[PDB]
Design an enzyme around this catalytic site. Structure first.
Site, PDB file in Angstrom:
ATOM      1  N   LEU A   9       0.773  -1.234   0.000  1.00 41.21           N
ATOM      2  CA  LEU A   9       0.000   0.000   0.000  1.00 41.21           C
ATOM      3  C   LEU A   9       0.813   1.299   0.000  1.00 41.21           C
ATOM      4  O   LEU A   9       0.756   2.082   0.962  1.00 41.21           O
ATOM      5  CB  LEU A   9      -0.963  -0.010   1.183  1.00 41.21           C
ATOM      6  N   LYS A 185       9.930   0.106 -19.145  1.00 36.92           N
ATOM      7  CA  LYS A 185       9.690   1.028 -18.061  1.00 36.92           C
ATOM      8  C   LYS A 185      10.989   1.782 -17.727  1.00 36.92           C
ATOM      9  O   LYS A 185      10.972   3.001 -17.507  1.00 36.92           O
ATOM     10  CB  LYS A 185       9.136   0.251 -16.845  1.00 36.92           C
ATOM     11  N   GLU A 192      12.320  10.321 -19.429  1.00 34.30           N
ATOM     12  CA  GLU A 192      11.696  11.230 -18.490  1.00 34.30           C
ATOM     13  C   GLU A 192      12.763  12.161 -17.913  1.00 34.30           C
ATOM     14  O   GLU A 192      12.595  13.390 -17.932  1.00 34.30           O
ATOM     15  CB  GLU A 192      11.028  10.428 -17.382  1.00 34.30           C
TER      16      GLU A 192
END
Lengths: 478, 478
Positions: A9, A185, A192
């Site tokens: 999480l 990725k 990026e």
């Protein structure tokens, strides 16, 4: 019985889960510190789809709730914890089940984890996720690689949570075997870096030229309206520039100039170097960060040699987006960014040849159009270029027109920034070299260095007129 | 008995053998194809020291003849070739003997080998050597490292064979433990790459400006007499430039523009990146070679976009070294070269602390003064600089004066070449950015990028005014 289980999480893990919950699938959730699971269920108790959110205590309980074959997205950003989590799981899981690592580690590690596992009966898949916090919640891009059959099982769940491009296509697609997804990725994060640094330089340049944070934003905003550069990164730069502190001043001025990084960029640079494809912008993007991290050293050097870097300066007569120089910068950026994408794809193309992923380049690029950080207008014609002719020498060819139009401006702008301003432009600079060098049939310096190596090392050199190597008889130099 | 053994007779092996036996030591020789040893003793049978040379049968014999503890210098090709050789020796040797690997291994492999062997009761030494064929014979520089115990046992042979610098000190010193010696050699080769490239760029630029091969030579020639740049590499550049083919034309014009490489440069780049130290010139040096190896692609790109790199051009009025333009190009190189060395040395400084080698920089940098490829005038003041203040922030400060004087010239030249010339200058460019960036206390692009990372990844950022990390609240963007 839960349709999918989500492990970890974090920034992504929780948002992703919700996204998938809201899409209507029952998702078992699991975290290391059960407490967090509580806080999580709490903040989302009232959601309309909180009935699809089953939180758990023990892995063994979590594993039984999933419809065989289980499906677990490992969203624990780690390297080690990811392997630790894979062990927990591996034990409580059964022959046939699936483990999808959406992790963010070296594609090389994915090739390992996969290979062990299949021989241990479980099925693996290394899959990337880009979009950040918002992207995770609303619809990111995924980049899977691994078992061809494993994909078909998972396809429904991810295609539903993926961002949809302007053509209704979900930004997810099987990229090929093994670590193919994690490689994509990796290089994604690579481009990026180069692009964020390009905007960062633009900021530094304009500030140097006299514009204040607001005036800069207006030119970014003008450039956004011209359409070609419309991108997420552009949007965030505008936000970043307009941002203001509690005391009503620009946030940027209170920001310590040290850029952290987490590795994806570092590795892409090292592998590009490894396989040997030239990617100057990708490297200097990492180097540019390394520059910042050495804040202490830079401060010391400065003290030792006060204002050594001093230049004549250049204050802008016309601080408006229509000013002549600002239009020169525009073109520079357009081309510079285009070359960043170029290099990024060339690395991927080469990486496929070498690792044999069976990569379908035009299918992969198409999934860059939304959700991911690299999304933006340019992705449309780039996808089409690789669709039109898949074996194009290089991506820049497709933009020969745009490039001719602004190349001189690109050259003049950096010439002016170099002689007149007190700013370092690592990436804008490396990018121009990429363009000039890549369109040059004969690089003369290669003739000299090639001979030099023969002088001391007697390595020999290839000739353009014979075949095989030749070695010259040189006079003694000591 | 025999004083010391040599295994492998490459360009380096043979010469070093002769180097050693000439100095008064008996030298046992071995090789795979006994034919090669035959050919060795063959051609060198008349030499006044041949009686100090003995070609051997098997390792049984070779290891038989040596004065205990056996000292062997492996001189074969890096990689599996070395691995094997060390294994053969391992059988035929005994507790306490010494294996001195001298063939270009990645410093991490040496550290491993050291341990393997140390746990097996043998001593190891990773020892780089530089100087090329000629240097191997006349006396090169050696970069040893590993157990101190071995060093003092070998100090005589290596000192007597190594080149002696001005103060008569030999270019050898114990560099630290494990792979400290191989590390130094790796970074030595890294600086070499950058500097060779700088000369290559100079060739390109002057050719572009209208000078013919003989006229650039005259420029270098003048640069040599100015003394500051006096160096081996300068000399070979002059030879390379002057060289003529059988058809009486310049050799360079028949040379295939593809620069081969053998790794040392590549790894130095990858580790510099790894530990995080900024070395833009070391990094682009490798890339510039990558640019040349993609000759095919470059040729195709050029066909699909003819005359795309077309520039105004710039022909010189005086091709004489007194030309003002030639004068700024001079300052450029001087400064470029200085930053190359600086970067190189910072890499070693950090390498040492991360890897704990216990390296003594001033002793190390002193051994670079002669015998190795990087030898030249500059190594003298540089050596002093580190003897004077061992913890000086960056070597560039010791050269504050010269930098202050030529910096604008350096900027204007690069500005000129960028704007008008149709040539790529990867390393002359990166090096200028290294200088401007390293002396700048606040890099503003670092402020923007820092905040950008917060926007999407919620990574937070460090403040220059608060302490710890802070994270802003941003508008939705999608």
């Amino acid at each position: 019985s839960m349709d999918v289980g989500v492990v970890g999480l974090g920034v992504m893990g929780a948002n992703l889960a919700l996204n998938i919950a809201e899409k209507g699938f029952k998702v078992a959730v699991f975290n290391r510190t059960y407490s967090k699971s509580e806080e999580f269920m709490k903040a989302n108790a009232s959601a309309p789809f909180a009935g699809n959110l089953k939180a758990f205590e023990t892995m063994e309980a979590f594993a039984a709730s999933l419809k065989k074959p289980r499906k677990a997205l490992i969203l624990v950003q780690a390297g080690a914890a990811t392997d630790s989590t894979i062990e927990q799981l591996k034990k409580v899981f059964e022959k046939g089940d699936i483990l999808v690592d959406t992790g963010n580690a070296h594609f090389k590690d994915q090739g390992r984890r996969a290979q062990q596992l299949e021989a241990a009966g479980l099925r693996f898949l290394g899959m990337g996720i880009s979009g950040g916090e918002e992207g995770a919640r609303k619809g990111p891009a995924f980049f899977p690689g691994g078992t061809l059959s494993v994909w078909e099982e998972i396809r429904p769940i991810v295609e539903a949570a993926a961002a949809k491009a302007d053509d209704g296509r979900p930004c997810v697609t099987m990229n090929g075997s093994g670590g193919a997804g994690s490689c994509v990725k990796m290089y994604h994060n690579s481009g990026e870096y180069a692009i964020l640094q390009i905007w960062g330089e633009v900021f530094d340049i304009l500030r140097a030229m006299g514009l204040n944070n607001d005036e800069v934003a207006a030119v970014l905003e003008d450039w956004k309206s011209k359409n070609f550069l419309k991108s997420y990164m552009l949007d965030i730069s505008i936000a970043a520039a307009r941002a203001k502190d509690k005391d009503g001043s620009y946030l940027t001025e209170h920001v310590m100039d040290r850029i952290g990084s987490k590795g994806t960029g570092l590795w892409s640079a090292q592998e590009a170097l490894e396989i040997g494809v030239p990617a100057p912008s990708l490297n200097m993007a990492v180097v540019s960060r390394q520059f910042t991290m050495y804040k202490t050293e830079r401060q010391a050097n400065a003290s030792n040699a006060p204002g050594i870097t001093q230049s004549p300066g250049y204050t802008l007569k016309n601080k408006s987006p229509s000013g002549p120089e600002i239009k020169q910068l525009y073109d520079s950026v357009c081309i510079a960014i285009i070359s960043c994408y170029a290099q990024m794809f060339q690395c991927l193309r080469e990486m496929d040849k070498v690792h044999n992923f069976g990569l379908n380049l035009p299918a992969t690029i198409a999934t860059f159009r939304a959700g991911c950080i690299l999304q933006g207008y340019l992705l449309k014609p780039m996808t089409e270029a690789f669709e039109k002719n898949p074996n194009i020498s290089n991506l820049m060819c497709a933009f020969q027109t745009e490039i001719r139009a602004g190349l001189q401006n690109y050259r003049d702008m950096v010439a002016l920034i170099t002689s007149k301003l007190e700013v370092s432009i690592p990436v804008l600079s490396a990018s121009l070299n990429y363009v000039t060098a890549m369109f040059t049939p004969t690089l003369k310096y290669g003739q000299l260095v090639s001979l030099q190596r023969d002088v001391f090392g007697r390595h020999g050199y290839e000739r353009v007129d014979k075949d095989g190597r030749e070695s010259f008889q040189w006079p003694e130099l000591q």
